[PDB]
Design a protein around this nucleic acid. Structure first.
Ligand SMILES: O=c1ccn([C@H]2C[C@H](O)[C@@H](COP(=O)(O)NP(=O)(O)OP(=O)(O)O)O2)c(=O)[nH]1
Ligand SMILES: [Mg+2]
Ligand SMILES: [Mg+2]
Ligand code: NA
Length: 326
DNA sequence: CGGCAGC
DNA sequence: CAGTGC
DNA sequence: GCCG
């Protein structure tokens, strides 16, 4: 019953599309209002519906699906029998505004709520009257770019620009696009670049020089999260734009990790997000702990040279990245 | 029922 | 820190 | 929202 234990290709044959589309609207509404645990239950139910092997015929049949309970089976049959979901007609008027505000990179549910209770209703209100962090100011000026997904091929060019720049300093550096790119998706919301060195030595100073190299050449246009540490890993989030006409500003995430942590970092950064949460929860039930750095016990780091070792240690069959798209 | 991933 | 996003 |  664990998502991390099954191939996400089951979702490709979604036999209940018009039901999950309406539930997705409700899930998004609960999210932007900060009710994260109710949102999480809807997300879980929707993946369960997407991978069910047939159309849901009845209340009893919907309840036979792990992740579907009484209240969800009720809504499934309401849609199945009426083509409509009455719950959608009573969503608060604030929700689309809170969604608009939380689409700004750097403004979450609490910031969106604060701006709404100040009377703000549009982006023009935020621009002219809201006090913005430097991050939110960059998220606001690239609002429409950051909402658009990029073709697979553009992410390739972005990773290549980072790779060649990193290898100009040390030709041994290994660079890998992760996230939705490594999962084989046709489009990517951002580019997630994982960097390590197989010599196993610490390379503290290279990252700083890599980032200035990308700024000096005009590729990096803004910082969102400047270089920072996470244990022995280093992380940067920023804004790049490929050269030439008709290019959008794209978000770029770069993590540098010691080789000893490569498999677990690669596993995390490949996702999906719900795959990771499912897998980490499974580890917790087995007295273990899974993070970006390591698989541990309740803490002894267990040796994980490759992703397959994590799957094995958790009793899970291996899944190619494309089968983790939950 | 409290947990719901873990940085 | 919080808030935030990955 | 759902569940061990
Ligand atoms: O909440 C999260 C978000 C991301 N992650 C991991 C998995 C995800 O694949 C990876 C990169 O995060 P992104 O936001 O870039 N998601 P993804 O690349 O899967 O999709 P997109 O095409 O939207 O970038 O970080 C989590 O573990 N938990
Ligand atoms: Mg991504
Ligand atoms: Mg903090
Ligand atoms: Na946001």
């Amino acid at each position: 019953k664990w998502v991390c234990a099954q191939p996400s290709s089951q979702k490709a044959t979604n036999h209940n599309l018009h039901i999950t589309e309406k539930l997705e609207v409700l899930a998004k509404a609960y999210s932007v209002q900060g009710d994260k645990w109710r949102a999480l239950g809807y997300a879980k139910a929707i993946n369960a519906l997407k991978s069910f092997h047939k159309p849901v015929t009845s209340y009893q049949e919907a309840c036979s699906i792990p992740g579907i309970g009484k209240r969800m089976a009720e809504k499934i049959i309401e849609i199945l029998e009426s083509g409509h979901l009455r719950k959608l007609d009573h969503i608060s008027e604030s929700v689309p505004v809170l969604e608009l505000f939380s689409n700004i990179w750097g403004a979450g549910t609490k910031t969106a709520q604060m701006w709404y209770q100040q009377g703000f209703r549009s982006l023009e209100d935020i621009r002219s009257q809201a006090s913005l962090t430097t991050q939110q100011a960059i998220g606001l000026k690239h609002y429409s770019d950051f909402l658009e997904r990029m073709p697979r091929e553009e992410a390739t060019e972005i990773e290549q620009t980072v790779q060649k720049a990193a290898q100009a300093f040390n030709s041994g550096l290994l660079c890998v696009a992760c996230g939705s790119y490594r999962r084989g998706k046709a489009t990517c919301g951002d580019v997630d670049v994982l960097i390590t060195h197989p010599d196993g030595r610490s390379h503290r100073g290279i990252f700083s020089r890599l980032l200035d190299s990308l700024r000096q050449e005009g590729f990096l246009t803004d910082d969102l999260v400047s270089q920072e540490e996470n244990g022995q890993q280093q992380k940067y989030l920023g804004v790049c734009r490929l050269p030439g006409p008709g290019r959008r500003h794209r978000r770029l995430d770069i993590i540098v990790v010691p080789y000893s942590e490569f498999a677990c970092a690669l596993l995390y950064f490949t996702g999906s997000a719900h795959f990771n949460r499912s897998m980490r929860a499974l580890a917790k039930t087995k007295g273990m702990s899974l993070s970006e750095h390591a698989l541990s016990t309740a803490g002894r780091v267990l040796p994980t040279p490759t992703e397959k070792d994590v799957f094995r240690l958790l009793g899970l069959p291996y899944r190619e990245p494309a089968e983790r798209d939950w």
